[PDB]
Design a protein around this nucleic acid. Structure first.
Ligand SMILES: [Mg+2]
Ligand SMILES: [Mg+2]
Ligand SMILES: [Mg+2]
Ligand SMILES: [Mg+2]
Ligand SMILES: [Mg+2]
Ligand SMILES: [Mg+2]
Ligand SMILES: [Mg+2]
Ligand SMILES: [Mg+2]
Lengths: 132, 220, 338, 51, 63
RNA sequence: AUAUACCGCCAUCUUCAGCAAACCCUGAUGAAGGCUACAAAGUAAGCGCAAGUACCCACGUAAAGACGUUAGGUCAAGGUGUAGCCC
């Protein structure tokens, strides 16, 4: 039986978001890609560098906003600008959210030599698409 | 409001026959309607012996003497429930009279279930209709046997749910669990028509009397 | 390497092995929270960042990046250790469960009032007692030796209303819920003489279970099988003797007991049936008769036959006890209050 | 036992309210020790106090 | 709630007993009507049984 | 070392349409069972199938294929529990 990125059924007790609910074979069918950049297009270079940068960005944001991330990030690249659009929880105080946003922006900008804008969309709780 | 509700509800219970249902039928009328013809002696159910006048050429004769009193009580109870605005649900799996019973119920402003009785329609009502559904306050079996001659499961379900049941019990029917059994024929069109007419008349009389009494008091 | 790091959820999934080949048929560890005891912005270096882990404004002005002394950081570490220990102790404590008929037996354990009904009906006056818990199995086509919990629960209000229900479920709490909810819809009403005992001696044999219940005076207590004691407490019976013989299957005993108690005939019912007064002779009250129940209808003028010798079948055990020949060492032992 | 677990419950012949709890109200017989769980010493004290 | 033990007593008996015990907070709509005009036979359940020995149906032939 | 502790990704029936929580009922309230359409106690959210989608149609091929079985494979993708070496 297939296991890749599938949330196995339960007694209607586990909420799941759109991304978690939809399985890999739905990519580009019912769900888009979490990262958008020109690396993977035909005849485009540095896909490996973009992939490594994206992996580090995810592992960094998840640890910097512990538990505060409601759903996976969305990475967008335009020229050199890097936009990290995140959906977070309305638990941590706005002062701490702003401090973390500024810290992350500055550190990522100085680490990857490109402007980085971190956009936050706050929700009361993890969005529930269906109960599995 | 307590005095108003008391004089509206308890008052008819002070009278032996508040709706004069006795005028709706006579033993001669039942005999003409053929209420007295039962099934063969072989098809006789053990609990219908007290209501069988005898056997004529291996065919049972339901004692219309007893049927008269039983129908008087059943019609009085039905009229009281209709006056009190309870929900009356007619039931019959006889496909011949399904349409007639449905029309009679729709005309008298009461409910009818002549179709396949899905399981749990009474015991599981709070799930099959919503937690706040209201169950029938009286169930009237124009035919207590299903289409395989076993007792209609609605009889057992109503007994479980504490819903009083008026019911026409033939010689092969089981009258133990029917609250008000009216021993009589249930397979002839004349008998079925007489039963439907009597119950419709009783319900309409009760409702009109209820409205008249409400208006009479509220005018005061 | 950093790129091999995973999340706490995946790590705990891999570690606890909650799922696996063994767990399917039952062929030790438990999860812990490693994020509760943390404040965003606190690290081993003991840095104080304004706006994240220390207040941003002090004296109405922005604070500066600071660092706790070595000893101050050690103090914070000791405080964190103390909080961790307190949480660990709060987990170490255990519930002082009241035990039923035995320390590790479910029988006699109280499950509390049944849940309120869909129509807002409340049964807070009721109490639920577990009488049996079986781990019934049944081979399946693919799942093999499936495991299920069969539960029997008695629900009663101590005022004559009491019923019992069977509960089937894979989860024990699910079975408890099912049984204690299904019981309230199957309530009997048990007539109690003087609201403390049955009206007359009851002899019955439900299936292969014989029940011999003897009416007893006030203060006699419940000298009955433990399940019968529980059911009597639920019903509202305080004084009664009861002996169970033959198969003592708990479900059979419960069903037969409820049948007999429901079928008992009241003094008023007897008076109406026989058209005569019901007279009670109490030894403590001397010859003074007490008219416990009288008929509603016309009292009979017939004095009723004064039989010289009855033909009722006598229980050999009862006759033996009356004659005193019963030497059973176990009979009439001193036992805790019931 | 019940008496030894509450030092304020002093068994004296004047504490009739406490003594009445170890005597059957309906028959006036002092409960045997296993009925209440009282140790033998406190049961003997209770018997003497009730008498 | 009610008492779905249709095989124990009659609907009237069960309803009356629960009301007396206080389980049923309010009497059902039909209770008073029934009490005022009870049927000739209490609708107590009764399991049917076949006549085995010399017992026979006391049904006379109409001649 | 341990796939006989696991995650992770999978083989397998599967070229299957069943799995179903929560209710209700039957069996005297036993394990258990719940089927008759000119219908007789089943109702079922959810998952799967299906549907929808890619390829060239609406076809076909892909994809998908639940719950479980074989303690099926992988400690040698990587991580991880346990145990073990640490000149
Ligand atoms: Mg017929
Ligand atoms: Mg122990
Ligand atoms: Mg394996
Ligand atoms: Mg395969
Ligand atoms: Mg394929
Ligand atoms: Mg498909
Ligand atoms: Mg293996
Ligand atoms: Mg191998």
């Amino acid at each position: 039986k297939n296991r890749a990125a599938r949330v196995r059924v339960s007694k209607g007790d586990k909420p799941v978001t759109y991304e978690e609910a939809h399985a890999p074979h739905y990519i580009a069918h019912r769900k888009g890609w979490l990262s958008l950049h020109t690396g993977n297009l035909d005849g485009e270079d540095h896909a490996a560098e973009r992939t490594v940068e994206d992996v580090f960005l995810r592992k960094f944001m998840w640890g910097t906003f512990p538990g505060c991330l409601a759903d996976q990030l969305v990475l967008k690249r335009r020229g050199n600008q890097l936009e990290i659009c995140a959906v977070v929880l309305r638990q941590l105080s706005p002062h701490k959210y702003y401090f973390l946003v500024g810290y992350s922006e500055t550190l990522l900008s100085y680490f990857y030599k490109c402007p980085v804008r971190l956009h936050l969309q706050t929700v009361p709780s993890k969005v529930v698409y269906k109960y599995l | 409001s307590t005095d108003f509700n008391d004089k509206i509800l308890n008052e008819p219970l002070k009278h032996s026959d508040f709706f004069n249902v006795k005028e709706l039928f006579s033993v001669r009328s039942l005999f003409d309607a053929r209420v007295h013809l039962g099934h063969k002696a072989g098809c006789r159910h053990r609990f219908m012996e007290p209501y069988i006048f005898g056997s004529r050429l291996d065919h049972d004769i339901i004692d219309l003497e007893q049927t008269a009193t039983h129908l008087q009580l059943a019609l009085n109870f039905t009229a009281h429930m209709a006056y009190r605005k309870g929900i009356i649900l007619f039931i019959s799996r006889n496909r011949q009279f399904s349409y007639l019973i449905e029309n009679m119920a729709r005309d008298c402003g009461e409910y009818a279930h002549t179709r396949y009785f899905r399981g749990g329609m009474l015991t599981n009502a709070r799930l099959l209709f919503g937690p706040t559904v209201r169950l029938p306050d009286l169930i009237i079996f124009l035919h207590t046997l299903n289409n395989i001659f076993e007792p209609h499961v609605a009889v057992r379900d109503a007994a479980k749910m504490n819903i009083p049941t008026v019911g026409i019990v033939d010689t092969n029917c089981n009258p133990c669990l029917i609250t008000y059994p009216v021993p009589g024929n249930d397979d002839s069109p004349l008998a079925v028509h007489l039963y439907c007419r009597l119950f419709q008349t009783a319900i309409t009389r009760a409702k009109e009397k209820r409205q008249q009494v409400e208006a009479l008091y509220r005018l005061q | 390497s950093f790129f091999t790091k995973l999340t706490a959820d995946e790590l705990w999934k891999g570690a606890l092995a909650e799922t696996g080949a063994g767990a399917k048929k039952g062929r030790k560890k438990k999860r812990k929270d490693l994020n509760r005891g943390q404040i965003i912005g606190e690290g081993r270096y003991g840095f104080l960042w304004p706006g994240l882990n220390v207040p941003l404004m002090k004296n109405g002005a922005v604070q500066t990046i600071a660092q706790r002394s070595k000893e101050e950081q050690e103090k914070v570490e000791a405080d964190m250790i103390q909080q961790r220990e307190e949480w660990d102790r709060k987990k170490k404590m255990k519930v002082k469960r009241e035990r039923g008929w035995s320390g590790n037996s479910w029988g006699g354990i109280s499950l509390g009032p049944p849940d309120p009904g869909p129509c807002g009906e409340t049964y807070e006056d009721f109490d639920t007692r577990i009488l049996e818990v079986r781990n019934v199995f049944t081979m399946t086509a693919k799942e093999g030796r499936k495991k299920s919990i069969r539960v029997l629960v008695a629900v009663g209000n101590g005022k004559g209303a009491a019923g019992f229900s069977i509960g089937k479920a894979t989860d024990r709490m699910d079975a408890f819920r099912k049984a204690k909810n299904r019981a309230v819809h199957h309530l009997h009403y048990i007539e109690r003489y003087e609201d403390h005992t049955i009206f007359h001696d009851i002899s019955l044999r439900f299936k292969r279970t014989h029940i011999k219940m003897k009416k007893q005076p006030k203060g006699y207590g419940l000298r009955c099988h433990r399940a019968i004691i529980t059911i009597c407490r639920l019903i509202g019976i305080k004084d009664m003797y009861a002996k169970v013989s033959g198969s003592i299957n708990m479900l059979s005993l419960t069903q037969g007991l409820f049948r007999g108690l429901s079928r008992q005939e009241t003094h008023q019912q007897l008076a109406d049936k026989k058209g005569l007064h019901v007279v009670e002779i109490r030894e403590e009250c001397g010859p003074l008769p007490i008219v416990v129940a009288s008929p509603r209808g016309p009292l009979r003028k017939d004095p009723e036959p004064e039989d010289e010798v009855p033909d009722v079948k006598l229980d050999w055990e009862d006759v033996k006890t009356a004659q005193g020949m019963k030497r059973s060492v176990w009979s009439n032992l001193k036992r805790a209050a019931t | 036992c019940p008496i030894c677990r509450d030092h304020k419950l002093h068994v004296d012949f004047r504490n009739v309210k406490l003594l009445e709890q170890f005597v059957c109200a309906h028959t006036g017989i002092i409960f045997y020790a296993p009925y209440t769980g009282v140790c033998v010493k406190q049961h003997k004290r209770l018997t003497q106090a009730i008498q | 709630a009610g008492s779905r033990l249709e095989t124990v007593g009659s609907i009237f008996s069960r309803t009356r007993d629960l009301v007396r015990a206080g389980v049923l907070k309010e009497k059902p709509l039909w209770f008073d009507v029934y009490d005022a005009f009870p049927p000739l036979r209490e609708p107590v359940f009764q399991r049917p049984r076949v006549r085995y020995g010399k017992a026979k149906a006391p049904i006379q032939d109409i001649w």
